[PDB]
């Protein structure tokens, strides 16, 4: 509960709602800039450091073999800790297409704080999921191996019902669950009876064998159900098995931001409660070996801007640290593009 104001460098105009913050061994990087990669920085990914509330978005470079990737604006990212690397999926490219590839990114060399990434385009084979955005992906271990569980979000209408009077309309995807094998990138769909509605902009936690899905906007009915779901999974000798459960103690929030305050215990911060009701109070989620719960914590202090603005966005930094942005009024003496804040919990 340590809010702090922030000032920014000169190129503030590369911060757009729906970026990504990749935390590599203390260092942190910003991905998903606005507009295609300029000539100042051909990779569109920055080393994003901040000292004394002044942050210096510096360019990063890739390897000799990476796959120069477009800046996605709402992808699904997860921390594949098996060396440490990141998985990116889908998103919405600058030209408003939707990608359907896997992007596996790691560090090939960091010498004297001079980083050098490498990213690879891993492709799904089999019952691949359609291209979509706002969805969620988590990695989960069991029996010494691991698999990627993917829960879908929203997407464009299929390639038949596209009409140029509603060409940019979106609907939820069929609430399946996609099991992905990264060792060979193979895809297996699975249907489960406990889940009914399509879910988007939810929160996905992975207790080492069991994934918890909380919150989410249900586009099919324009409501935000408080239905939290637990998903147990096991991979036996043959094809794995999935199971769902519904547990009490729900909450209704969409587009929330997650971070790990303590091992086996997270905090969740303000996303949105209703399309007219933002979320000012934060909730401590107490994970566990087999059970979990959610309580309401002591509403970290805001300011006039955040409590008065209409929207917000951002993400985590990895070390119990949140980065948030604020539009900032334009009916003034030509205010800046965005204002910013950093949240701490220690």
């Amino acid at each position: 509960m340590s809010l702090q104001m922030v000032t920014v460098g000169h190129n503030i105009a590369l911060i757009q709602p729906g970026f990504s913050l990749m935390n590599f061994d203390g260092q942190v990087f910003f991905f998903g800039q606005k507009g295609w990669p300029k000539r100042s920085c051909p990779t569109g990914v920055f080393h994003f450091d901040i000292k004394q509330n002044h942050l210096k978005l510096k360019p990063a470079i890739f390897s000799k073999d990476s796959c120069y990737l477009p800046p996605l604006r709402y992808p699904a990212t997860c921390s594949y800790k098996g060396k440490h690397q990141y998985i990116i999926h889908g998103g919405k490219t600058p030209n408003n297409e939707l990608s359907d590839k896997i992007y596996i990114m790691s560090v090939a060399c960091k010498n004297n704080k001079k980083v050098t990434f490498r990213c690879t385009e891993k492709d799904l084979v089999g019952d691949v999921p359609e291209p979509r955005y706002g969805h969620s992906i988590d990695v989960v271990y069991s029996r010494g191996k691991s698999m990627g569980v993917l829960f879908g979000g929203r997407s464009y209408m299929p390639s038949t019902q596209r009409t140029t009077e509603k060409w940019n309309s979106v609907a939820d995807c069929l609430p399946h669950v996609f099991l992905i094998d990264f060792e060979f990138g193979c895809a297996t769909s699975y249907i489960l009876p406990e889940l009914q509605d399509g879910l988007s902009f939810h929160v996905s936690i992975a207790r080492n064998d069991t994934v918890y899905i909380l919150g989410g906007h249900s586009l099919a009915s324009n409501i935000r159900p408080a239905n939290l779901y637990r998903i147990r999974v096991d991979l036996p000798l043959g094809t794995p098995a999935v199971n769902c459960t519904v547990l009490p103690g729900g909450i209704s929030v969409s587009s929330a931001i997650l971070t790990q305050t303590n091992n086996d215990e997270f905090v969740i911060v303000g996303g949105y409660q209703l399309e007219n009701q933002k979320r000012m109070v934060c909730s401590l989620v107490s994970l566990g070996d087999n059970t979990i719960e959610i309580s309401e914590m002591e509403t970290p202090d805001w300011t006039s801007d955040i409590k008065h603005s209409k929207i917000w966005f951002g993400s985590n930094m990895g070390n119990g640290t949140i980065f948030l942005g604020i539009p900032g009024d334009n009916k003034q003496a030509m205010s800046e593009a965005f204002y910013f804040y950093t949240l701490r919990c220690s």
Binding site: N96, W167, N168, H217
Partner: protein, 378 residues
């Protein structure tokens, strides 16, 4: 004559009251004849039916956003946009010039009752026109821009007997009364995301109606149309951005060929045109994929400066207005340079330069009375 809808009423009632017999029609009878000219009033059918395009024939002014979901949970988008469809606009653009194409058919010694496969040539253009707002509240420092996407019919041709004939040609193409608007929006011309989000449906319809035929009665009997779309009215900045090249400060200069300034300055004039659109697209592909596992500094050179996904098939060709203005300012600067005679003594500082400019401007205002201006006009 830019009248209003009430001033016209003033004129109408006063004329009718003074001279008894009415000379101007009422407002309602004006709107009923307005409808017969706006797009989306006539039947028309495609052959084969256009994939992804609706079949209705009664679509007027469609919201440009194209049903873009805008809820706080998603990307914040606030621009305004209005548009027609593309077929419903081409139809009306042809059916207003029905008489002007039939007259040409007559003049060119052709049996009026002909229904050959007409071919239309359509020039497409687009250019941001920012600083459109007003400080109605007398408070300054509040800008806003806008964008208009518009097209033009320029030549209607039928293939009678052995060859083609110019059934219709445009008298004065690049004037302001024969370029028809198609959509418009309030968004900065460089706000790439919003720009693509609004202009994608138009390109969808345009690529759809490139391998079909439109059957439509043309003065009685039915006729068949097919089209050709050349996109040319793009300034330098647009064609540099949407076609997916590095910005105008690049080492790569010509939007038509692939030569660096430090190379064209030596091989003066022996080039060609070798930068199409499909080549551009596959080159962006080889950029993104990077199959050769080679570093960036030579990959950029291999792909001749393409770093984005182009999303508009545009033909390359020099603009006229901006080219002439550029040349003009160009040798104006060479005049200002020749004041200082720097060829004899080089490397002067940036105060002799301002003095040279002042002397030139004053001498010109005294001799030829050319007023002083910062932003040169045609």
């Amino acid at each position: 004559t830019f009248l209003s809808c009430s001033q016209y009423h003033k004129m109408y009632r006063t004329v009718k009251a003074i001279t008894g017999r009415q000379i101007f029609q009422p407002l309602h009878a004006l709107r009923n004849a307005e409808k017969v000219l706006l797009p989306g009033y006539h039947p028309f059918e495609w052959q084969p039916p256009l994939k992804n395009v609706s079949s209705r024939t009664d679509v007027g002014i469609i919201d440009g956003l194209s049903g873009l979901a805008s809820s706080v949970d998603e990307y914040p988008v606030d621009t305004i946009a209005k548009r027609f469809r593309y077929d419903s606009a081409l139809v009306s653009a042809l059916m207003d010039m029905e008489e002007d194409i039939l007259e040409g058919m007559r003049s060119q010694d052709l049996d009026d009752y002909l229904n050959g496969p007409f071919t239309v040539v359509v020039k497409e253009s687009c250019d941001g026109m920012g600083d459109v707002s007003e400080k109605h509240g007398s408070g300054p420092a509040v800008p806003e821009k806008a964008v208009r996407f518009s097209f033009t019919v320029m030549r209607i041709t039928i293939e009678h007997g052995s060859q083609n004939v110019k059934v219709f040609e445009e008298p004065k193409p690049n004037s302001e009364l024969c370029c028809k608007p198609l959509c418009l929006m309030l968004a900065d011309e460089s706000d790439h995301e919003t720009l693509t989000a609004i202009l994608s449906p138009l390109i969808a319809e345009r690529e759809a109606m490139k391998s079909s035929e439109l059957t439509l009665e043309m003065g009685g009997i039915p006729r068949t149309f097919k089209f050709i779309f050349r996109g040319t009215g793009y300034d330098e900045k647009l064609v540099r951005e949407v076609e997916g090249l590095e910005a105008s400060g690049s080492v790569y200069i010509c939007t038509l060929c692939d030569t660096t300034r430090l190379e064209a300055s030596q091989n003066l004039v022996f080039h060609s045109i070798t930068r199409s659109h499909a080549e551009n697209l596959q080159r962006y592909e080889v950029w993104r994929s990077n199959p050769y596992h080679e570093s960036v500094e030579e990959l950029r050179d291999r792909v001749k400066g393409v770093s984005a996904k182009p999303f508009i098939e545009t033909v390359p060709s020099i603009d006229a207005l901006h080219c002439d203005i550029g040349n003009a300012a160009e040798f104006y600067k060479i005049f200002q340079l020749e004041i200082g005679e720097v060829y004899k003594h080089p490397n002067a500082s940036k105060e002799e330069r301002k003095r040279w400019q002042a002397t030139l401007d004053k001498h010109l205002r005294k001799r030829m009375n050319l007023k002083p201006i910062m932003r040169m006009n045609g």
